[PDB]
Amino acid sequence: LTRFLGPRYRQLARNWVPTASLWGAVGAVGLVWATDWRLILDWVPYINGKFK
Amino acid sequence: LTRFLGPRYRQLARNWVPTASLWGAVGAVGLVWATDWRLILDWVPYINGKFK
Amino acid sequence: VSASSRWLEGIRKWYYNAAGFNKLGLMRDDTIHENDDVKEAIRRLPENLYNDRVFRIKRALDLSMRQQILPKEQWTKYEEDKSYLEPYLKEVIRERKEREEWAKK
Amino acid sequence: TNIRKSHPLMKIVNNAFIDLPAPSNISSWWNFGSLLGICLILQILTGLFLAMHYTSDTTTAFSSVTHICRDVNYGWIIRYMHANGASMFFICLYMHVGRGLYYGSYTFLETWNIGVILLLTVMATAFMGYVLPWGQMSFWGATVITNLLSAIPYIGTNLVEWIWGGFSVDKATLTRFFAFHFILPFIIMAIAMVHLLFLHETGSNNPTGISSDVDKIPFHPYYTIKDILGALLLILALMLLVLFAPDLLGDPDNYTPANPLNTPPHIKPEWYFLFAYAILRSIPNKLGGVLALAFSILILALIPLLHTSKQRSMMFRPLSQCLFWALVADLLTLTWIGGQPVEHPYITIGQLASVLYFLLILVLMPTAGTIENKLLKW
Amino acid sequence: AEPEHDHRKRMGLKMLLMMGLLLPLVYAMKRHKWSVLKSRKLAYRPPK
Amino acid sequence: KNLLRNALVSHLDGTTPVCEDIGRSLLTYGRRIPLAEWESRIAEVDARVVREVCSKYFYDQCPAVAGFGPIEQLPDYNRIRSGMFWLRF
Amino acid sequence: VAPTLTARLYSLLFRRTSTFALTIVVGALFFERAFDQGADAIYEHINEGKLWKHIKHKYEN
Numbered sequence: 091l092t093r094f095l096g097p098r099y100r101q102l103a104r105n106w107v108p109t110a111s112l113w114g115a116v117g118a119v120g121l122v123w124a125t126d127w128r129l130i131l132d133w134v135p136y137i138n139g140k141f142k
Numbered sequence: 143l144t145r146f147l148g149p150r151y152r153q154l155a156r157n158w159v160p161t162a163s164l165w166g167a168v169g170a171v172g173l174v175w176a177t178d179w180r181l182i183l184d185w186v187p188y189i190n191g192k193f194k
Numbered sequence: 195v196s197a198s199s200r201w202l203e204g205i206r207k208w209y210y211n212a213a214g215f216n217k218l219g220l221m222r223d224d225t226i227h228e229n230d231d232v233k234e235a236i237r238r239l240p241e242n243l244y245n246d247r248v249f250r251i252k253r254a255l256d257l258s259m260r261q262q263i264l265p266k267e268q269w270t271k272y273e274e275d276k277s278y279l280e281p282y283l284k285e286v287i288r289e290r291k292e293r294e295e296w297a298k299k
Numbered sequence: 300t301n302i303r304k305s306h307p308l309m310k311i312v313n314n315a316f317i318d319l320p321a322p323s324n325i326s327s328w329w330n331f332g333s334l335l336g337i338c339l340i341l342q343i344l345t346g347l348f349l350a351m352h353y354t355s356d357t358t359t360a361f362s363s364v365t366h367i368c369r370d371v372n373y374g375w376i377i378r379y380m381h382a383n384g385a386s387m388f389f390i391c392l393y394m395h396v397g398r399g400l401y402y403g404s405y406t407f408l409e410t411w412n413i414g415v416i417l418l419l420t421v422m423a424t425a426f427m428g429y430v431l432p433w434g435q436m437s438f439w440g441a442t443v444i445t446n447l448l449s450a451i452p453y454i455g456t457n458l459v460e461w462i463w464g465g466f467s468v469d470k471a472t473l474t475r476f477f478a479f480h481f482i483l484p485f486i487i488m489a490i491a492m493v494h495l496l497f498l499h500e501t502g503s504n505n506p507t508g509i510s511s512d513v514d515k516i517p518f519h520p521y522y523t524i525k526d527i528l529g530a531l532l533l534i535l536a537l538m539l540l541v542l543f544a545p546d547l548l549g550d551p552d553n554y555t556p557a558n559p560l561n562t563p564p565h566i567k568p569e570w571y572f573l574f575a576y577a578i579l580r581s582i583p584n585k586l587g588g589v590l591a592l593a594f595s596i597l598i599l600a601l602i603p604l605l606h607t608s609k610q611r612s613m614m615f616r617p618l619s620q621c622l623f624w625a626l627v628a629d630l631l632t633l634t635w636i637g638g639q640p641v642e643h644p645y646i647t648i649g650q651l652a653s654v655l656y657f658l659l660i661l662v663l664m665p666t667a668g669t670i671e672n673k674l675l676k677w
Numbered sequence: 678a679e680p681e682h683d684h685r686k687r688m689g690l691k692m693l694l695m696m697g698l699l700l701p702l703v704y705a706m707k708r709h710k711w712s713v714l715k716s717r718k719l720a721y722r723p724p725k
Numbered sequence: 726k727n728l729l730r731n732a733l734v735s736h737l738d739g740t741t742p743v744c745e746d747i748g749r750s751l752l753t754y755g756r757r758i759p760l761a762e763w764e765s766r767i768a769e770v771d772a773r774v775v776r777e778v779c780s781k782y783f784y785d786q787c788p789a790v791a792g793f794g795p796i797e798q799l800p801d802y803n804r805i806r807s808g809m810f811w812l813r814f
Numbered sequence: 815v816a817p818t819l820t821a822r823l824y825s826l827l828f829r830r831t832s833t834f835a836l837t838i839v840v841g842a843l844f845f846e847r848a849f850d851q852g853a854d855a856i857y858e859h860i861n862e863g864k865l866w867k868h869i870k871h872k873y874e875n
């Protein structure tokens with residue numbers, strides 16, 4: 091449990107933070123696009139084709 | 143196709159004829175019993191409980 | 195020996211060029227179907243004939259992928275088709291026939 | 300070492316779809332293996348989504364199907380996918396079988412005979428599916444076929460009345476066909492896994508019929524992308540039928556509810572059964588028609604026993620190629636005759652084509668392989 | 678008899694357009710991977 | 726870095742290694758790079774330099790492969806080429 | 815001349831697989847609207863005056 095507490099294991103977290111942050115954007119944008127989530131999509135310029 | 147034509151192969155047929163004849167009786171009696179085949183069963187003494 | 199046996203040979207050369215495995219560089223014994231007798235005969239080939247068989251099959255499979263053929267100069271000529279496998283396959287069959295004749299007694 | 304190879308689950312997927320050594324020269328006729336797998340899955344998904352709205356009762360079976368195409372959201376696209384997916388299933392099955400005859404793949408006995416069982420169960424599946432909408436052809440197609448079983452001697456009527464659940468195609472027949480049409484596609488998929496179990500024991504054949512162990516390539520990426528491309532063409536063919544001609548392969552009579560009293564004029568099966576319907580009607584005798592009708596498909600199990608050629612594939616056998624396409628054209632003749640009334644001259648043509656079918660498979664094609672052996676001097 | 682008539686044709690048009698894009702691109706992906714094999718060259722050098 | 730420092734000093738031990746380092750360097754570098762300069766360039770390397778420098782030459786690059794012997798199990802070039810990137814990254 | 819567009823597309827978006835995916839999911843969002851908008855414009859143009867949205871204004875009140 092406490093094997094992963096040290097300098098090297100914090101360096102590994104540093105190296106994968108830019109990647110893990112991008113997969114979260116891929117998942118987030120993929121969730122908004124797949125469900126047509128209007129809360130987020132209404133703020134995008136070209137996808138305002140709703141005509142409420 | 144003609145590998146099995148000789149003295150030995152006729153001796154093997156001789157040795158398994160009593161067995162193959164008994165499995166045919168097991169299959170035949172098993173077919174009559176499973177289906178209640180009245181054509182054959184009506185001739186057996188104790189299984190004449192039909193009352194036509 | 196006569197003009198009629200050249201016509202039987204004439205249609206055999208016709209069917210040979212119609213079979214078209216010569217277009218891929220193959221020989222007749224390269225195309226044989228591998229049963230147990232054929233597998234033993236191939237196993238008994240000397241090193242040089244085995245390695246030659248392997249490359250011709252490999253080259254023909256490469257052509258079959260591309261749907262291509264060899265130039266006509268490199269096709270297998272009917273007169274030069276070497277039955278390199280038939281003497282080995284004849285002997286494998288002869289041995290099996292002997293085993294099958296002992297099994298009858 | 301490698302997780303993909305040592306994990307109990309991934310090693311089966313790895314040794315089947317990824318690291319499988321496959322021949323470098325298998326052509327487009329080898330794509331129909333995966334396409335059949337896709338069609339089976341495609342028929343199960345659409346089949347399930349239709350079962351969420353279909354009811355297996357005569358008073359509502361016809362209208363529940365109508366309820367799907369009209370009221371259910373995208374019900375019409377799901378139905379015609381199912382009806383046309385069945386036809387695409389049979390296109391692929393016939394290419395798949397024809398590939399095996401031409402190229403000699405039937406020498407894999409266990410793989411081939413399990414294929415014959417797969418052909419029979421898929422045919423039985425589609426036959427029962429066509430009954431479920433309960434149209435005119437649904438009823439009368441079921442009547443003329445199931446009545447053939449009465450020709451079996453000494454147990455005919457008892458067997459037919461047991462399959463019916465009564466004295467004719469009726470309520471009890473419609474409901475059980477739905478249950479059997481539901482259970483069978485999963486039994487099919489399990490047999491398709493055993494179909495692959497025996498195949499991977501040997502690997503694939505190839506167009507030349509010569510062993511390809513000297514030249515193998517991994518199934519991934521070469522045949523993963525080739526099957527994906529082939530699957531994309533399958534969706535093109537399906538969607539062209541669904542979105543531009545969904546009623547081309549179907550019969551208009553099935554848009555009329557069932558009617559045990561009024562018979563349609565021309566009772567014709569779907570296109571993928573016309574060849575066997577012709578063989579049935581060309582035999583005058585009733586019991587003889589059933590045997591020939593059953594022998595029309597069970598004959599495939601005899602092809603390995605009737606192989607005479609020293610060569611495996613027909614690629615290097617011109618005299619057998621001509622007889623192979625004589626079998627296709629003769630089957631295209633039986634298909635044509637099957638969709639026509641039993642009148643002159645179609646009666647005589649259907650009898651000639653029926654004899655030519657069994658003569659090509661039993662006599663002529665085996666004889667050609669022997670002639671071809673003599674011309675090559677072996 | 679076919680209330681879905683107009684909508685399937687609208688879908689049919691989109692299917693043709695997507696297929697006209699996706700078919701050559703997927704074909705190109707197939708040829709891309711296979712080019713390793715389609716241009717491979719063989720040579721046989723047995724000892725003599 | 727420590728393996729390299731030991732390798733560099735262990736190699737320049739003897740008149741013939743040093744004579745080679747002199748001759749070859751004057752043709753390639755046009756000068757003799759002192760050992761103190763190699764230590765400066767080695768000490769500059771850290772984990773960031775290795776990640777950037779290795780990615781510049783390895784990540785998603787076409788390799789040249791050469792095989793000889795019983796190499797039936799040698800992976801196909803496309804599979805080798807796919808091993809030059811990670812889908813997780 | 816600076817490197818081609820495909821070269822700057824690779825190093826900037828396609829090198830990392832994570833940005834390669836972010837490019838696709840973002841490209842899928844704008845492609846859907848642009849393709850559905852354009853494709854519907856072709857269907858309605860070919861069927862001018864026949865669809866309900868064309869004869870809609872006649873029965874307003």
Ligand SMILES: CCCCCCCCCCCCCCCCCC(=O)OC[C@H](COP(=O)(O)OCCN)OC(=O)CCCCCCCCCCCCC
Nearest residue numbers: 261328393394396397398401506574613614627630631634
């Ligand atoms: C039982 C069900 C009955 C239902 C009836 C259905 C109606 C049938 C409609 C006919 C459609 C015909 C399909 C197109 C045929 C194209 C053939 C071809 O392109 O040329 C011959 C080809 C030669 O290729 P080789 O491999 O010999 O050598 C290649 C070297 N470049 O050789 C080959 O590629 C041939 C491979 C086999 C193709 C299979 C097609 C036949 C389908 C029905 C078979 C049913 C058997 C019981």
Ligand SMILES: CCCCCCCCCCCCCC(=O)OC[C@H](COP(=O)([O-])OCC[N+](C)(C)C)OC(=O)CCCCCCCCCCCCC
Nearest residue numbers: 120121124527530531785810828829830831834835838839
């Ligand atoms: C709940 C909500 C969730 C929503 C989530 C939405 C996400 C959408 C997709 C985004 C993921 C992309 C992943 C990726 O991009 O990694 C897949 C792989 C990479 O591609 P690559 O090899 O260039 O390496 C890439 C090398 N680089 C990175 C250095 C350039 O992509 C390929 O290879 C495969 C592409 C082929 C497509 C066809 C597959 C479908 C199956 C068949 C369809 C037809 C019949 C059914």
Ligand code: HEM
Nearest residue numbers: 329331332333335336399404405414415417418491503504
């Ligand atoms: C649901 C039905 C079936 C499915 C899903 C299926 C699937 C497959 C698949 C995926 C393959 C390997 C890839 C390929 O060869 O294309 C294959 C091979 C094969 N199948 Fe089927 N199959 C089915 C039915 C049949 C039938 C009806 C037959 C013949 C009567 C048959 C005979 C064969 C043979 C002989 C092979 C080996 C072909 C070769 O190696 O060249 N299968 N099948």
Ligand code: HEM
Nearest residue numbers: 342343346347349350353378382385425428429431432484
């Ligand atoms: C090999 C797989 C399958 C084949 C070949 C097949 C074939 C067919 C065919 C041809 C029809 C006639 C459709 C029509 O004329 O409208 C049908 C009907 C039907 N099938 Fe299937 N089917 C398969 C799998 C399934 C499965 C797994 C289910 C259930 C989960 C299912 C549920 C239905 C239903 C509810 C109907 C009646 C609705 C209708 O007629 O459209 N099918 N099937």
Ligand SMILES: CO/C=C(/C(=O)OC)c1ccccc1Oc1cc(Oc2ccccc2C#N)ncn1
Nearest residue numbers: 425426429430440441444567568569572575576592
């Ligand atoms: C319920 O009837 C279904 C039919 C159909 O075509 O379903 C797809 C059908 C319609 C009209 C007339 C007959 C029909 O059924 C059939 C069924 C059929 O089944 C076989 C197919 C191949 C080989 C043997 C048989 C049998 N028996 N062969 C011919 N017609």
Ligand SMILES: CCCCCC(=O)OC[C@H](COP(=O)([O-])OCCN)OC(=O)CCCCC
Nearest residue numbers: 120121122123124125126127128129130131132
């Ligand atoms: C896991 C199953 C999720 C099912 C969600 C669903 O079917 O879609 C509902 C909404 C529709 O978008 P909206 O802008 O109308 O929003 C209307 C809000 N009710 O989409 C969402 O908002 C997606 C939310 C994802 C959370 C896990």
Ligand SMILES: CCCCCC(=O)OC[C@H](COP(=O)([O-])OCCN)OC(=O)CCCCC
Nearest residue numbers: 173177178179180181182453454455457458461
């Ligand atoms: C393979 C499926 C067979 C289905 C037979 C069936 O369901 O049973 C019918 C008869 C009943 O016995 P019977 O004396 O009334 O006889 C009445 C005769 N109709 O049983 C038999 O006669 C068995 C015949 C077995 C032949 C294969």
Ligand SMILES: CCCCCC(=O)OC[C@H](COP(=O)([O-])OCCN)OC(=O)CCCCC
Nearest residue numbers: 519520523524803804806807808809810811812
């Ligand atoms: C939901 C998205 C899932 C993503 C999985 C994925 O794409 O699989 C990997 C391959 C390409 O990567 P590679 O084989 O070069 O491996 C790279 C190793 N570094 O892609 C394909 O060609 C496989 C086909 C999948 C069909 C379902």
